[PDB]
Design an enzyme around this catalytic site. Structure first.
Site, PDB file in Angstrom:
ATOM      1  N   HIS B  41       0.906  -1.386  -0.148  1.00  0.00           N
ATOM      2  CA  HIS B  41       0.064   0.012  -0.071  1.00  0.00           C
ATOM      3  C   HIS B  41       0.753   1.427   0.017  1.00  0.00           C
ATOM      4  O   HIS B  41       0.181   2.153  -0.041  1.00  0.00           O
ATOM      5  CB  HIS B  41      -1.075   0.257   1.226  1.00  0.00           C
ATOM      6  CG  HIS B  41      -0.582   0.264   2.618  1.00  0.00           C
ATOM      7  ND1 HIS B  41      -0.697  -0.945   3.514  1.00  0.00           N
ATOM      8  CD2 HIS B  41      -0.067   1.379   3.144  1.00  0.00           C
ATOM      9  CE1 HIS B  41      -0.209  -0.423   4.638  1.00  0.00           C
ATOM     10  NE2 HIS B  41       0.128   0.912   4.532  1.00  0.00           N
ATOM     11  N   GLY B 143       2.366   6.025   9.708  1.00  0.00           N
ATOM     12  CA  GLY B 143       3.837   5.841   9.474  1.00  0.00           C
ATOM     13  C   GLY B 143       4.637   4.487   9.989  1.00  0.00           C
ATOM     14  O   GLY B 143       5.462   4.385   9.612  1.00  0.00           O
ATOM     15  N   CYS B 145       3.570   1.541   9.471  1.00  0.00           N
ATOM     16  CA  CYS B 145       3.324   0.327   8.464  1.00  0.00           C
ATOM     17  C   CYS B 145       4.586  -0.025   7.675  1.00  0.00           C
ATOM     18  O   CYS B 145       5.660   0.898   7.788  1.00  0.00           O
ATOM     19  CB  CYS B 145       2.520   0.475   7.442  1.00  0.00           C
ATOM     20  SG  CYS B 145       0.782   0.936   7.855  1.00  0.00           S
TER      21      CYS B 145
HETATM   22  C1  LIG Z   1      -3.953  -0.592   2.888  1.00  0.00           C
HETATM   23  C2  LIG Z   1      -4.431   0.068   4.407  1.00  0.00           C
HETATM   24  C3  LIG Z   1      -3.729   0.776   5.039  1.00  0.00           C
HETATM   25  C4  LIG Z   1      -4.325   1.301   6.463  1.00  0.00           C
HETATM   26  N1  LIG Z   1      -3.364   2.004   7.043  1.00  0.00           N
HETATM   27  C5  LIG Z   1      -3.346   2.438   8.459  1.00  0.00           C
HETATM   28  O1  LIG Z   1      -4.191   1.689   9.223  1.00  0.00           O
HETATM   29  C6  LIG Z   1      -2.224   3.065   8.959  1.00  0.00           C
HETATM   30  C7  LIG Z   1      -2.156   2.878  10.606  1.00  0.00           C
HETATM   31  C8  LIG Z   1      -1.411   1.599  11.021  1.00  0.00           C
HETATM   32  N2  LIG Z   1      -1.404   1.344  12.309  1.00  0.00           N
HETATM   33  C9  LIG Z   1      -1.929   2.337  13.079  1.00  0.00           C
HETATM   34  N3  LIG Z   1      -2.379   3.356  12.693  1.00  0.00           N
HETATM   35  C10 LIG Z   1      -2.231   3.654  11.381  1.00  0.00           C
HETATM   36  C11 LIG Z   1      -5.505   1.077   6.878  1.00  0.00           C
HETATM   37  C12 LIG Z   1      -6.316   0.293   5.654  1.00  0.00           C
HETATM   38  O2  LIG Z   1      -7.647   0.121   6.295  1.00  0.00           O
HETATM   39  C13 LIG Z   1      -8.387   0.146   7.276  1.00  0.00           C
HETATM   40  C14 LIG Z   1     -10.060  -0.303   7.130  1.00  0.00           C
HETATM   41  C15 LIG Z   1      -9.577  -1.343   8.112  1.00  0.00           C
HETATM   42  O3  LIG Z   1     -10.192  -2.057   8.700  1.00  0.00           O
HETATM   43  N4  LIG Z   1      -8.080  -1.056   8.211  1.00  0.00           N
HETATM   44  C16 LIG Z   1      -6.019  -0.208   4.824  1.00  0.00           C
END
Ligand SMILES: Cc1cc(NC(=O)Cc2cncnc2)cc(O[C@H]2CC(=O)N2)c1
Ligand SMILES: Cc1cc(NC(=O)Cc2cncnc2)cc(O[C@H]2CC(=O)N2)c1
Lengths: 304, 304
Positions: B41, B143, B145
């Site tokens: 992503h 951030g 990820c």
């Molecule tokens: C490809 C992708 C990336 C992210 N990014 C993130 O969560 C960023 C992040 C990570 N961890 C903590 N805080 C922030 C979310 C996505 O969908 C949400 C709908 C669901 O369920 N998940 C799908």
């Protein structure tokens, strides 16, 4: 989101761990520049530990009796000295992995990461608080002496703790990197009283702000209190009295959540008086006090 | 003595963290040999995330669009490919800090350490369990990820997790290092149901053995049970059913404490049925399930 007892990345400290052997005793040493720091009780035998005369014991030792090993390479000891409860072994080679570092003496209530070591090899890393009674509730076994506590700011490692002993109560005692014990402890195998411990009030409030930031808001109420009224409750429950210095340190968290510090104090008061009623806060069924206001901001902001 | 949620020393993994930028998006990458692994992503913009066609998005990208930075040095991207939900960026330089490593797909109930990172820089380390519902209760922000989960055996790092997303419920979802999600999760910004989670029974029993080893014995009783009777209680309290495989894995702890596994099951049964009565076990007011039998033995034996 989420809140965990997070330790600093331990890499900079792993590159400093060495094994120190003197006679039959092996413990951990900290190699910074051309000096190796370790607990002075490495020179003790079983009979010595009960009431050691470190000055007399160290006199029967020469540089060649201190065996220092960093991984597989042996270090050459060219000098030895005692500074309070630590030995400083001068070696002929500066540690090429020595990070930017400082020796600091942390305050009670402050936190740090511990890199637990055996035979100079790191086994694990965990976050600790220096208790108000100058003990740490760590996880250490025989051979762990010489393991260190630290904090990291950017690229600088501030070493604050060196592990020396376990009291019969299971809690841990140690020194700063100049060998001065935290608390009234002496490095002798005699039963030692750690004082009455208290809960670090400013840290519990910081953790309550971390809970609000992470969605756990059930404990919030329609009440407020004063520093004096709250402190009467704190004394009743063995909590450290809250001062304006603590309120000021909680300032950024109060600003972030929009919850006045005295309103958070009223939530804590009700939690102390009524318990948690079988509920949890940040996955905990008790009031957590090993996160400082700085730890909360750092974790909730992603400081690297 | 003492028992802590201890993470592996993170040094070997810190030397692998890099920053990956594609267009406006920056996340973490894992640099092993001449390959950098990161969540796919990273090629998405805000409008893409809602329903991305990764194949179409990746086609508009060339090697020069992937900006890979390890500390201050830029890496030259000479190849790019997608494997399930991870991108593999081939770089012209092998990581000189690459440790001995394996990619493993951990089982639910197993534990691992997470090195939380932002912009390719490590911020902290904590221990997690892969929940029975294939989520992890981590601590991650935007951030984070690309941050990874791992275990260390001697000198070998077994990477088991790469962070991809936070569900609206605050729990975390990610993949193994081949980009296969743990659980039913897809890398798309749509509300996703994590299944009903259960408590990892074998881990709670392992932690009860850790409590006995550390002196906390109040919960021990004059009762025993059978696997079938205990499992009726486990189902009532959303605990995973206990099998003979779990009893066998608990063997060394049963041998060390001299407490038969079914006797420990009877203690757990009484704790489930009657609660903790305001008491604590290893400083916890709830039954802990994020320590495996292996973690207990390792911590209680000092494995480096
Ligand atoms: C490809 C992708 C990336 C992210 N990014 C993130 O969560 C960023 C992040 C990570 N961890 C903590 N805080 C922030 C979310 C996505 O969908 C949400 C709908 C669901 O369920 N998940 C799908
Ligand atoms: C110089 C010295 C060293 C050690 N050694 C140890 O505890 C070794 C150790 C460390 N941590 C965990 N498990 C084991 C004890 C000493 O006195 C006991 C009497 C008391 O109180 N403390 C005095």
């Amino acid at each position: 989101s989420g809140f965990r007892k997070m330790a600093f990345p331990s890499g900079k400290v792993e590159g400093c761990m060495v094994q120190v052997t003197c006679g039959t005793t092996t413990l951990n040493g900290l190699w910074l520049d051309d000096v190796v720091y370790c607990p002075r009780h490495v020179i003790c035998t079983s009979e010595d530990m009960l009431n050691p005369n470190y000055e007399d014991l160290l006199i029967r030792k020469s540089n060649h009796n201190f065996l220092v090993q960093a991984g597989n390479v042996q270090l050459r000891v060219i000098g030895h000295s005692m500074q309070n409860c630590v030995l400083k072994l001068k070696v002929d080679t500066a540690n090429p992995k020595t990070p930017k570092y400082k020796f600091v003496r942390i305050q009670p209530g402050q936190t740090f990461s511990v890199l637990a070591c055996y035979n100079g090899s790191p086994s694990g890393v965990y976050q600790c608080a220096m208790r108000p009674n100058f003990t740490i509730k760590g996880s250490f076994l025989n051979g762990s002496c010489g393991s260190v506590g630290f904090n990291i700011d950017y690229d600088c490692v501030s070493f604050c703790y060196m592990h020396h002993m376990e009291l019969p109560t299971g809690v841990h005692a140690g020194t700063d990197l100049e060998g001065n014990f935290y608390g009234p402890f002496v490095d002798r195998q005699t039963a030692q009283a750690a004082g009455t411990d208290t809960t670090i009030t400013v840290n519990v409030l910081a953790w309550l702000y971390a809970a609000v930031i992470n969605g756990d808001r059930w404990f919030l109420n329609r009440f407020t209190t004063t520093l004096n009224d709250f402190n009467l409750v704190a004394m009743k429950y063995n909590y450290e009295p809250l001062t304006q210095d603590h309120v000021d340190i909680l300032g950024p968290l109060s600003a972030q959540t929009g919850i006045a510090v005295l309103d958070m104090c009223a939530s804590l008061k009700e939690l102390l008086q009524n318990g948690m009623n079988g509920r949890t806060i940040l996955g905990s069924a008790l009031l957590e006090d090993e996160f400082t206001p700085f730890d909360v901001v750092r974790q909730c902001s992603g400081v690297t």
